[PDB]
Design a protein around this ligand. Sequence first.
Ligand SMILES: [Mg+2]
Ligand SMILES: [Mg+2]
Lengths: 516, 516
Amino acid sequence: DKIRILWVDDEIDLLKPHILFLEKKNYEVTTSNNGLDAIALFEEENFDIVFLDENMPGMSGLETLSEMKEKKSAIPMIMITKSEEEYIMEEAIGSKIADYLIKPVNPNQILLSLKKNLDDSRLITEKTTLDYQKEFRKISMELAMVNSYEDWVELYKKLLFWELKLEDINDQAMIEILESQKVEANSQFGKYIERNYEDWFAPKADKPIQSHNLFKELVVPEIKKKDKPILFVVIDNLRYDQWKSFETVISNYYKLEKEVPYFSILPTATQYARNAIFSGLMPLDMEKQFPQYWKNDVEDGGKNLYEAEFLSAQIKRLGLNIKEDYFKITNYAGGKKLAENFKALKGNDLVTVVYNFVDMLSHAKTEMEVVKELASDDKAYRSLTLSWFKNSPLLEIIQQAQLLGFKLILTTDHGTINVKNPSKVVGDKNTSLNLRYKTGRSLTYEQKDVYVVKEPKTIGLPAINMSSSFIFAKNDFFLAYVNNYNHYVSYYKNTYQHGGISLEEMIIPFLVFNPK
Amino acid sequence: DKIRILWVDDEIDLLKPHILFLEKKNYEVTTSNNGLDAIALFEEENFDIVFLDENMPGMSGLETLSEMKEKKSAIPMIMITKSEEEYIMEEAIGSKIADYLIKPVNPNQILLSLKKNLDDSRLITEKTTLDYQKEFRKISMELAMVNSYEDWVELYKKLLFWELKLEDINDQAMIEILESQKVEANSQFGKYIERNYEDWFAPKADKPIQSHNLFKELVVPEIKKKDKPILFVVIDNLRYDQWKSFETVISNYYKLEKEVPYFSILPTATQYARNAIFSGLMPLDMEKQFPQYWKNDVEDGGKNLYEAEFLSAQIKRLGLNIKEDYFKITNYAGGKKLAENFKALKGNDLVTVVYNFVDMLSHAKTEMEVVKELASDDKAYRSLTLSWFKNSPLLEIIQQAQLLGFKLILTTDHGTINVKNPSKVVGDKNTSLNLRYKTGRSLTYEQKDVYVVKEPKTIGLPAINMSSSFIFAKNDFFLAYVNNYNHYVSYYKNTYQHGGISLEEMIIPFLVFNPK
Ligand SMILES: [Mg+2]
Ligand SMILES: [Mg+2]
């Protein structure tokens, strides 16, 4: 099976040197000197690729292209033309041409196009495979050598780079090697946090940017430039790899200006971390300064009701004098309504949007078999996230914002992790259920599995009484009650949970973009 | 905001004519003469794109590329080099280069690369929009000019071509124009079937290939070539557009040899149409010849239990002497098990796999808000299907089959349609609750909404008595019982159902592929 090329050109006899060149490289070329007969040939025969000129007496190559793609849209098509006109370039690109080569053409430039457009998947798979064999050892080495939070960020970015490259490989041996490096990463990172998290709360401490610092340290510098209105979107419960999975979709509308990885406070829970973003305060100080807004034990509905109030209070405290609105999207319909009415916010200095879709999807994975099959592993969950995003009102909002010349800031409260191993726990139940952190007056737990803080106020968290403590799951543990243990294990094994310590949960993107 | 180019080349002074050219076109170029300095610049500054030569004293461009992509993988990178070596070409392509231009390079070839890699999304949107304005009238005209089943097939393929192209459009006014052309198409197509379906059962009638013809007419010619073993996959309940949505994924492993649109029998239901594929018989003749296998009144689990038996009987009747096995996958775990054990089927002439995923996903949309948000429209359902497929055991099975040099045949029983408008119905308490067809001895219905067949034996369907009849929903109607009406209507409105007449349900792909 030689690769079969259909070349359409009214002057095809002048390109016979190119045809001989390709035929010596095991390509079979069929020629046509008009579009009509070329289309007929293309319907009847199976060609791997088509080359087209633009200028033909009968019908333009661009017309021929549109007709051919209607008949078989999966066939790559390359324009080989004398035309250097920007309008023709744009027409070709807009018609989903694979490449556009300007005559006179180096035969090897044509060969390149053939390899780039027919063999890329194979070449990338081969290259990625061979590279990761050489690189997996270096990553383990670097992982063993990590002794700073900045180094943890850098390592995490290396892991993610490779995790994404490996998702277009079929070899399971290699994928398991990476899954094991992630496990080792989280183990070592868990210990790092256990040893350093408390010191970060000492005065004048060297510490990463965290939830309660975020708005003041990273958003306000963008506001104070006073060059553009800002859409500040907090996508609830987004992992760094989920961001990566739709980075390229966003890059069509927005150019990245700044990317700062930052750290969620503990617990890595929406009620604590996300409220902290908006308040600019640790949860202890939200309880002290806003007792009417802050909730400790609460049912699932009522954890993040006062974010607008928190944010406006912070904006006042920082003495910004800005037109600013807050919206929380909790469903499709609300999303649509904001995309439809977004024009009305042109006058604003700041529009802040919380987008809840994740944590309804993570919940769905626990409850139904189909969502489990769609999110079987992290690769699938990334795929499913990308699908959601591509077809979400959130992307429509971003599109709107770009048309109105808004700056886009994109971040999240905290990520999630696939939990695998149950760790036993006893203690009177909280109203809302979390599987990676607990707070209580009499908590029983396996100490090896959890970071324990016996004096919560030292890390900016509320204490119910003098005895109270917090525990945070490490690794991929989930905290299972001893009563009902077997059903807890069956239900929640291999679900996405949050609240504890992992790279996925704790290290998260903050992203600034300018519209294109 | 000029577009910012970083150009790395030890001989950058020789490229000053190119830089002047680009600077007149509103590009800003920053130059570097070695990879190290270039990497430093790339970390510090935000470049839209990077140009690299290969041959440099310090570092290979290929090395520089790998370093840069690790730091920011979303930035396109173009190699501009004297090198015509296939290994360098392949390394660049394998490293995810965006384009590879061979010096000396026409400045306009560079301009093309810039536009293709930075502006394609916009250019495609603009071109698709402008093209559909010019085409929408011609589509309506083509719909008016339909006088044959072949014409219906061609029209359906035109509609699908445009529906997918308009996926890349934000303008809703134009999308609604197309949705309305589809509605008119289904209206007219419903009437076509109403007028022609019975006459198609006369021999000597000009008729499309249908379920009961499929295996004999289209699979057996491939078996009788005796050149390769065949994996015959029936993806349960797949629409043509769902196939289109993952056509390119499959094209990495398999080259399309043949595509025949064919027509599902009525009802467009798995119990009738899929059993007919395997039996080679209409349901009436399955009842007569295989009473033990055919079931009229059966639970949803008991509808397609005897497909292996039907198929082996057909293979015998056609006097083929082939090693043939059948598998029905009903869950992830079963899918995995077959992909893991596929090597063991090396000797087989035919492997037949029924893959049930899609019917469960449509039920999920009905029962859960999250699936509804992920499949809000047909575009989202296509996106969600693509995601499933990319991460499915079915693709693993296909991959295995390709490694073993199997020919791939891909088809489906019938599609599904988003139902919108209830049509009232009484009677027909059949065990399973299908929403687009009913059979019973005394049916009350709105006759405008349904194709009615008073004597089922005339269209190859079973009749409980001479009073029995069948009804098939047209357009986007669903059959709603009068009892509990309001809750029935809320539950099933905007769900994917099947059993009736539409382009989506009835016209479906049969696809033959050779392995790559
Ligand atoms: Mg010409
Ligand atoms: Mg050089």
